[PDB]
Amino acid sequence: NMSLENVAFNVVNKGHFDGQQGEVPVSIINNTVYTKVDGVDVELFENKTTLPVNVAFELWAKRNIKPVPEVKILNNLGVDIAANTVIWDYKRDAPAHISTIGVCSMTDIAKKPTETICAPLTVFFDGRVDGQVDLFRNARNGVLITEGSVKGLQPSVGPKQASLNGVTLIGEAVKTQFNYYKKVDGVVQQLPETYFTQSRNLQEFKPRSQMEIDFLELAMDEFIERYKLEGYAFEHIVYGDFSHSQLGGLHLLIGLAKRFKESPFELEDFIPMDSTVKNYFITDAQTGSSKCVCSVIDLLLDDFVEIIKSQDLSVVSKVVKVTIDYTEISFMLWCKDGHVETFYPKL
Amino acid sequence: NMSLENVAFNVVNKGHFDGQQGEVPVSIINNTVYTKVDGVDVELFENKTTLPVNVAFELWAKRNIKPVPEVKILNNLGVDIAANTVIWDYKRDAPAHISTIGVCSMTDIAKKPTETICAPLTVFFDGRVDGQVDLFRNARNGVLITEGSVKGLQPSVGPKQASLNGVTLIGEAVKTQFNYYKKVDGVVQQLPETYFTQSRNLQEFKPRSQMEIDFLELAMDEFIERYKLEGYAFEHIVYGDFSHSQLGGLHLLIGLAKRFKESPFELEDFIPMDSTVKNYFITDAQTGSSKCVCSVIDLLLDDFVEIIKSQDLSVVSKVVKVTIDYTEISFMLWCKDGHVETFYPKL
Amino acid sequence: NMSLENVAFNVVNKGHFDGQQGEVPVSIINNTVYTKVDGVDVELFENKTTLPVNVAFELWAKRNIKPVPEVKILNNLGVDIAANTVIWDYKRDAPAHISTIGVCSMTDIAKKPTETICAPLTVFFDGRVDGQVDLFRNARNGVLITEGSVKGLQPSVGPKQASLNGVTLIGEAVKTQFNYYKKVDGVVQQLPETYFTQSRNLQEFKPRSQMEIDFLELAMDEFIERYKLEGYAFEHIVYGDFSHSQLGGLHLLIGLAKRFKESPFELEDFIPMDSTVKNYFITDAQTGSSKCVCSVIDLLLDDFVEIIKSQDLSVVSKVVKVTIDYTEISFMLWCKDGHVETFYPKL
Amino acid sequence: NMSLENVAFNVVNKGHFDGQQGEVPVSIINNTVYTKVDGVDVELFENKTTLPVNVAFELWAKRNIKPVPEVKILNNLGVDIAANTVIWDYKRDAPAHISTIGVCSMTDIAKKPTETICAPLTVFFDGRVDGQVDLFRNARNGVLITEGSVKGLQPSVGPKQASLNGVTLIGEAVKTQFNYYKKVDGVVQQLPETYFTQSRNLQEFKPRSQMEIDFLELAMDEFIERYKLEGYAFEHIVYGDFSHSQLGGLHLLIGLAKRFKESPFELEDFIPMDSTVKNYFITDAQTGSSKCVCSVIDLLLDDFVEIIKSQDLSVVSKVVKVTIDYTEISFMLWCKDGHVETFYPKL
Amino acid sequence: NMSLENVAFNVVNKGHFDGQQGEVPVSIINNTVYTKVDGVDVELFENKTTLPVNVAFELWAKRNIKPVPEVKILNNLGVDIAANTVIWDYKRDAPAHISTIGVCSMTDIAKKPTETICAPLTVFFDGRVDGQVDLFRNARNGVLITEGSVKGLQPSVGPKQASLNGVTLIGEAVKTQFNYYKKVDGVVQQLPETYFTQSRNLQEFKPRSQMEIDFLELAMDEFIERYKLEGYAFEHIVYGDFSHSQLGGLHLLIGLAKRFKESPFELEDFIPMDSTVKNYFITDAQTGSSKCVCSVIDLLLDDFVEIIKSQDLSVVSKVVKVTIDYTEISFMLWCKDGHVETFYPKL
């Protein structure tokens, strides 16, 4: 059954744990796993987790290598544990959940989710696995994803992108958009209307709408003129203000990407994890403008336009709730004389 | 007052220590600081210093987040300690000074620089902080920086660039050029005439003079012809010689940048720190030419021209002293028959 | 003689160990070596090996800084130890061999290869060093490299590239192609006909033949038409198939380089070492196609064409042996109705 | 500087650092220093300090092997650093002082005490070493020990015992009683008329007076009668109360020794260091009585009798300062109806 | 190879590795091996060796639990490695040998001693195991122990005592006296006529002869009289001098045992390993006499009397070679006027 040397055999021969028989010699020094190859030791894994090195090594080998939802999605849905699989958080380089079910003896709380210890927990079920749809039908609290329809259950469509081996992508040779289902205390839940973040990054940013194409290809004055955005303070919120010591606005990722192609800047991710809203310590190299906590979100520009245009601007300041990635994101809206001053999210 | 959990609260909520009240749960494993977020541990800080992890974590959170002089400047001025702040050396990923004054209990030698323990040390004072100019007037040995004039003190103007959160830049939304002052044994010192290095890097090198623009845009034969530099061995010193096994010359950073755009090469910084002269183990990928110790300095090309043209060339070899970044840099000048052979600095 | 502080003196002053006299203060914390510079500690070396930090630090300082064969070459020839030098494996960031001869007291099994302990081992000799050719003539088992001819020994010509300080290159200011010789049990061996891998990488890939230039500059249909490669399944083997969940083929490095310029992808080197065949866990960002174990080899495209055209295609599946880098590489050849289906190597 | 391997050579060949020349192979793993003895590694030093392993090993090797004052004596005199020697704290298994003077390059703030940086520090001088008395006269702050009189210096006779290699004892083949002198800001200070602790331990404990001899053999009631100790709470202060959950009194070490021979108990030294007054968490194995903080001190019984009998019993609670080991010890004095209730020291 | 979890299973269920099948959950943290016992982690092995934690744990589990020779015996015979077993050095808490033969894949240089790589190594064979005597005949270098005679092999009778699980004793329910044989380069060597050390320790010490019985009960003067030891410096060599600062003589263990019962003292084993002659840094608790290097050996008193009485006292200083534990021990012999002054062993 279980064996450290057998786990390393699979990694060496199959790139991951594939249930194959065999053993290779291993050495444990510090938080690193080595193996002997022609008389020399070769590093296989460096433990960046809070778990023992041999345990964390086992879970990483048994990680899910299929398209899975991003961890922030699972977090916003309150997933506590997965059923007979391991979700690897590549943002944290660690397992997404503390315990396991029928995966690793050191972390297993149960062999099956049918066991009594799993009832209060929100177990994640994968409909692509045989028998897991019915396990969800018998689970007290759980979350389920499927590719197609499910009889007797009104689905909730997720985002276009999913994580495959740490790579977030919109699948073309594989399906990445799932139907979502959730039960709480044996009662199926009606998932709310939500926006979805795009999970893009600066180095490889690509526009996904004609408005996003126009935003990047055109100038600030023309873009505001084309889409009639006067009074909404896009210069501050999206384009960002760099004239002063403290950086102004710059809360949309597409705004950061437009600047990065022309002027570099430093982003310090002082909370390195997968979350819908990301906070950064930013310093602009060209001007010297900086801000300690700059909340950034990767919303589609069209969706962001709809949100800010759907608000009341008669109050100097108030808190705005927006359901994004199935979680309720709080926004700070500042207005003066019927026009927007700033509008930023909070974590 | 002090608290590890309170320090992490500020980092999580404010990106740094901002004196706010609150606590978050933390874990110390190896040289890393974690915190719990929705039941999982998230890395906040990895100790790359020789100090205890919790102490180094505290100093990094309390680091100075305003434009500060680069560490090499402070080193050349003999700064031993800073007054009620922490200068973070991003080149070393560690505090620039061993002890502190009124910052961290574990490293504090004093609460104020007025205390008797601070008299022999060269304390760094920031004139932008209230009351620190007069503290410098009462300090026995110290260094002071200001933005404007100071009554009764003849200032010394520093370089255009300063470090902001590890980013060296010439500020446009903030001031980065300061006036410099120094006292030794209660006696104000007259700072010497000095050149200043430019603190640029290869990936983002930008010319800062028409001569530098001509150097990068033109060829070697034309550049020497335009600025009449025959007999000074710029082909060796600046452009570099790659025909032989040992690399020849290549001691100016602008020379490295011109090559890097056309041919890649490997630079091994065997002394990773902030210093006016940087020594590298270089290996040219295209040709195979290499040199163990290649001293490199980032001087403005015009300033470098003035220096080498201001020397006597009648001796085969001698040592040349040049005041750069307020420190006296030794150069090796080799000549033959009234013409320069090579001219390189030493660390 | 030997001294930790003296070794660090050479590194600081000469970039490596140069047998110079002097000492500097050092600190050992975790797997890292520091030294004091103006009262602060500066990191000199981080031990990424399975050896003690001070020992590994000594061997790294005494590493060979001349053009040396790549480790995979030495591995395929069965080199167990080097004579009075240290070969540093930059792929593993560790010594290429466990023990040493006359280098470090902690790892020395002998002072000279003439000693009785060295007879069974395959000792690597460098003909560029004085007296090492005759030592090879007296060694029982050994490997030798030279630049020119050797009297009484029929040479075997190696590859054009060699490793210089971790930089694999074809030397232009230095010679990188050597003559190879090997003795087993006092008997000179006749080295077999072998192909050689090119040791290129994706970021800096350059074609080395007109066929390689045509492969990158032209389309798939035209390239197959120009070089008449119908029925050999280059679309699968070289260009790669991304239409399905599992990635198809893509076993030649030049195929990866052509894709990388247009579409990015993730390569996970789960066995980080120098080997003729490299296995990767690949995930294509654009399509989502992936494969756990994708064997890749960097053969010249012309050589690869010659190999696959020199095979019999009448069997559904068989194992093909090819001598590459002096080792016998096993290939899997799949055919159907006289045409190639796939052809990939194994490690 | 110097050589780590040379330090290890002296240890194996001289038991300590004797300045002899020679070197041996050394391995540094974890916080442990090993050496190769005929192929196998032998542990030489387990670093239990807060300093780097190689540094602390050098300081432990250079520890003072002559009879030296106990660390509690030096601390009570405000000693900050030693002159050209290392005082080893065996009860902490660590150096008694942070920095050094002319001992170890890593910890040296100076090579000689006359250096300007040593002025504000109370430097410890050993008069038994040549030139150290004159260095004391030059020093601004310092403490001096001698075996005889110094010209014009008013001596302070210290305790009979001293520490020889972690062993506290009255020297018979050596002199363990010294004259003590102290300077504060260039001014000699008269040391106070003080008591001294006996520095005995629990398991090996010998009485040093007829009263102490009587205390161990006489019953509680008959001992109080012979020495007229009615109304002084000796039963509580010295004998101890075990009838209640919180342990009553028991603050003299000789009282602990008398009980330990009769009944065992546990002592938790939650502050493991050498100090005049020691605090212990004590649990009695027979009764179950316990106290979280029990202040204990090893005074001669005759001294404690003389001390407690010179007090005024007309106050309900009084703070009493007593000079012991050159420092003021504060006592709590509870009385009722002209009789002592309890009288315990405080740390 | 095999399984780390299987090794831990045998330890908890058999006290050691018994080859049984089964597995238990294991955690590796620091250099400690834990296992889960009803939810909690129980420490199983603290790695005190220079090998990886998992490797050393496997070797300790596979240690030889039969009576084996003491490590000082094997070292004195030049034993480099063991045949299909592990000898545990309990005085080092580490394997007695670096590599293994058919024991652990990580440390195995070979599976069987007949392999060609084991030829230049002195392999230890246990004649009590089937086939090991024949493997000794095939071996080029080796050492063999047996309980009885071997055909045609001239035996060497070893000491009465052996080590059973770190316990040295004379076997009563087992045989601890073996015949010893040795081969050097295929040639059997006659082992020298030797003495043997008694391998007793200080706290638990029993005399083994009437002379030793008399030594412990008789006074110094009356014991020398009964055994006619005038002019042989027994008072210095065996009894020891405490009147001076440097400790005089004291080189026989039975002399140490006689003093320890009367007065305690400290022994610093600065080279903690098993060897025929042990060096200690000694400090006497009563007098204060001390010596940095005090050579001690545990010989029977009758043997030492026989040895010292067969010497020639007509030389001021002489080096004396004595065969003890199959190795030559060098002695310093100082004499004056035909009388012994001191006679101490050297390590």
CA D325/CA C332 separation, integer angstroms: 85
Residue D77's alpha-carbon distances to D74, D147, D158, D324, D326, in angstroms, are 5, 18, 12, 11, 7
**Which element (helix H / strand E) includes B330?**
strand B327-336
Judge contact between D245 and D288, C-beta under 8 A: yes
Question: What is the residue whose two structure tokens read 């060093």?
Answer: C129
Tokens coding E131: 């086939």
Give the one of D4, D29, D36 whose C-beta lies nearest to C4's C-beta.
D4
C23 touches D at CB < 8 Å: yes
Contacts of A245 (CB under 8 A, 6+ apart): A288, A289, A290, B173, B174
Residue D240's alpha-carbon distances to C250, D218, D248, D252, D255, in angstroms, are 84, 16, 5, 10, 8
Contact between chains at D164 and E283 (C-beta distance less than 8 A): yes
Q: Catalytic residue, from D62, D182, D183, D251: name it.
A: D251
Q: Where are the alpha helices (DSSP H) in C15-96?
A: 53-61, 71-76
Smallest Cα–Cα separation from D286: which of D304, D307, D300, D266? D266
A25 touches C at CB < 8 Å: no
Q: Is C330 helix (H, G, I), strand (E, B) or coil?
A: strand
Which amino acid, A206?
A: K
Interface test with E, best of A1, A3, A38 (most E CBs within 10 A): A3
Own/partner contacts of D265-273, CB < 8 Å, gap of 24 or more, are: D267/D202, D272/D91, D272/D92, D273/D71, D273/D89, D273/D91, D273/D92
Contact between chains at C117 and E120 (C-beta distance less than 8 A): yes
- C116 interaction partners in chain E (CB closer than 8 Å): 120
Contact between chains at D67 and E288 (C-beta distance less than 8 A): yes
Geometric angle at alpha carbon C231, from C230 and C235, rounded to 5°: 75
Q: Name the DSSP class of D238.
A: I
D50 touches B at CB < 8 Å: yes
CA E289/CA E247 separation, integer angstroms: 5
Residue E203's alpha-carbon distances to C38, C245, E261, in angstroms, are 52, 73, 9
Contact between chains at A28 and E2 (C-beta distance less than 8 A): no
Q: Hey, which residues of B are catalytic here?
A: 236, 251, 291
Tokens coding E213: 């019985």
Return binding residues of B for uracil.
Answer: 291-295, 342-346
Return binding residues of E for uracil.
Answer: 291-295, 342-346
Q: Catalytic residue, from C291, C321, C336, C339: name it.
A: C291
Judge contact between C209 and C301, C-beta under 8 A: yes
Smallest Cα–Cα separation from C277: which of C340, C235, C324? C324
Q: How many residues does chain E have?
A: 347
Judge contact between C273 and A42, C-beta under 8 A: yes
Q: Catalytic residue, from C62, C182, C251, C258: name it.
A: C251
Smallest Cα–Cα separation from A302: which of A247, A248, A238, A240? A238
| Bridge-based pairing state of the strands E142-146 and E123-126 | parallel
D288 touches C at CB < 8 Å: no
Q: Chain A: give the shortest CA distance to residue B28, in Å.
A: 9
**Which element (helix H / strand E) includes B225?**
helix B220-226
E242 touches D at CB < 8 Å: yes
Q: Count CA within 13 A, CB hemisphere, residue E9.
A: 14
- C120 interaction partners in chain E (CB closer than 8 Å): 116-117, 119-120
Strand order in the sheet with D317-324: D317-324, D327-336, D339-345
Burial class (CB in 10 A: 0-12, 13-18, 19+), A172: middle
Q: Hey, which residues of E are catalytic here?
A: 236, 251, 291
Give the one of A67, A164, A173 whose C-beta lies nearest to C242's C-beta.
A173
Interface test with A, best of E24, E28, E33, E59 (most A CBs within 10 A): E28
Contact between chains at B169 and A285 (C-beta distance less than 8 A): yes
Q: Chain D: give the shortest CA distance to residue E170, in Å.
A: 27
Give the one of B50, B52, B117 whose C-beta lies nearest to D120's C-beta.
B117
Instruction: Indicate if D236 belongs to the active site.
Output: yes
CA C208/CA B89 separation, integer angstroms: 45
- E53 interaction partners in chain A (CB closer than 8 Å): 28-29
Question: What is the residue whose two structure tokens read 């110790």?
Answer: B293
Residues pairing with A187 in the sheet:
A184
Tokens coding C91: 């792929």
- B99 interaction partners in chain D (CB closer than 8 Å): none
Other C-beta atoms lying within 10 Å of the C-beta of residue A160 = 14
Residue B140's alpha-carbon distances to B111, B182, E217, in angstroms, are 17, 10, 74
CA E5/CA E44 separation, integer angstroms: 12
Judge contact between A49 and B29, C-beta under 8 A: no
E261 touches D at CB < 8 Å: no
Smallest Cα–Cα separation from B208: which of B66, B343, B304, B326? B304
CA B290/CA B298 separation, integer angstroms: 20
- A25 interaction partners in chain E (CB closer than 8 Å): 1, 105-106
The chains found to touch D (3+ Cβ pairs under 8 angstroms) are B, C, E
Provide DSSP, E72-133.
HHHHHTT--EESSSB-EETTTTEESSS-EESS-TTTEEESSTTSGGGTTS-EEEETTSTTHH
D286 touches C at CB < 8 Å: no
Residue E303's alpha-carbon distances to E184, E209, E233, in angstroms, are 30, 10, 16
Question: What is the residue whose two structure tokens read 């990388």?
Answer: C260
- C287 interaction partners in chain A (CB closer than 8 Å): 171-174
Residues pairing with E330 in the sheet:
E321
Question: What is the residue whose two structure tokens read 């190696």?
Answer: C158
Structure resolution, Å: 2.2
Q: Chain C: give the shortest CA distance to residue A90, in Å.
A: 13
A52 touches E at CB < 8 Å: yes
Domain ranges of chain C: 1-65, 66-191, 192-347
Which amino acid, C341?
A: E
Contact between chains at E52 and C50 (C-beta distance less than 8 A): yes
- Separation of CA B285 from chain center: 28
Residue C346 counted as an annotated binding residue: yes
Smallest Cα–Cα separation from C247: which of A17, A68, A164? A164
- C3 interaction partners in chain D (CB closer than 8 Å): 2-6, 23
Judge contact between A70 and A45, C-beta under 8 A: no
Other C-beta atoms lying within 10 Å of the C-beta of residue C327 = 18
C30 touches B at CB < 8 Å: yes
| Bridge-based pairing state of the strands C32-37 and C40-46 | antiparallel
CA C176/CA C154 separation, integer angstroms: 19
CB pairs under 8 A between D and E: 83
Q: Is E260 helix (H, G, I), strand (E, B) or coil?
A: helix
- C174 interaction partners in chain B (CB closer than 8 Å): 245, 287-289
Own/partner contacts of C18-23, CB < 8 Å, gap of 24 or more, are: C18/B292, C23/D1, C23/D2, C23/D3
Interface test with D, best of C1, C10, C26 (most D CBs within 10 A): C26
Return the HEC string of chain A: CCCHHHHHHHHHHHCCCCCCCCCCCEEEECCEEEEEECCEEEEEEECCCCCCHHHHHHHHHCECCCCECCHHHHHHCCCCEECCCECEECCCCEECCCCEECCCCCCEEECCCCCHHHCCCEEEEECCCCCHHHHHHHCCEEEEEECCCECCECCEECCCCEEECCEEECCCCCCCCCEEEEEECCEEECCCCCECCCCCCCCCCCCCCHHHHHHHHCCHHHHHHHCCCCCCCHHHHCCCECCCCECECCCEHHHHHHHHHHCCEEEECCCCCCCCCEEEEEEECCCCCEEEEEEEECCCHHHHHHHHHCCCCCCCEEEEEEEECCEEEEEEEEEECCEEEEEEECC
The chains found to touch B (3+ Cβ pairs under 8 angstroms) are A, C, D
| Bridge-based pairing state of the strands B26-29 and A339-345 | unpaired
Contact between chains at D40 and E94 (C-beta distance less than 8 A): yes
A202 touches C at CB < 8 Å: no
CA E24/CA E10 separation, integer angstroms: 9
CA D251/CA D278 separation, integer angstroms: 10
Which amino acid, C315?
A: V
Judge contact between A127 and A146, C-beta under 8 A: yes
CA C85/CA C65 separation, integer angstroms: 10
State the structure-solving technique.
X-ray
CA B127/CA B46 separation, integer angstroms: 32
- A284 interaction partners in chain B (CB closer than 8 Å): 173
Residue D104 counted as an annotated binding residue: no
Tokens coding C170: 């074809």
CA E154/CA E150 separation, integer angstroms: 8
Instruction: Indicate if C291 belongs to the active site.
Output: yes
- Separation of CA C52 from chain center: 25
Phi and psi of A11, rounded to 5°?
-60, -45
CA of D35: which chain E residue's CA is closest?
E271
A16 touches C at CB < 8 Å: yes
CA A293/CA A269 separation, integer angstroms: 10
Provide DSSP, B152-188.
TB--EE--S-EEETTEEE--SSS----EEEEEETTEE
Give the one of A14, A38, A174 whose C-beta lies nearest to C75's C-beta.
A38
Which amino acid, E143?
A: V
Burial class (CB in 10 A: 0-12, 13-18, 19+), D332: middle
Smallest Cα–Cα separation from A308: which of A298, A294, A322? A322
**Which element (helix H / strand E) includes B37?**
strand B32-37
**Which element (helix H / strand E) includes D319?**
strand D317-324
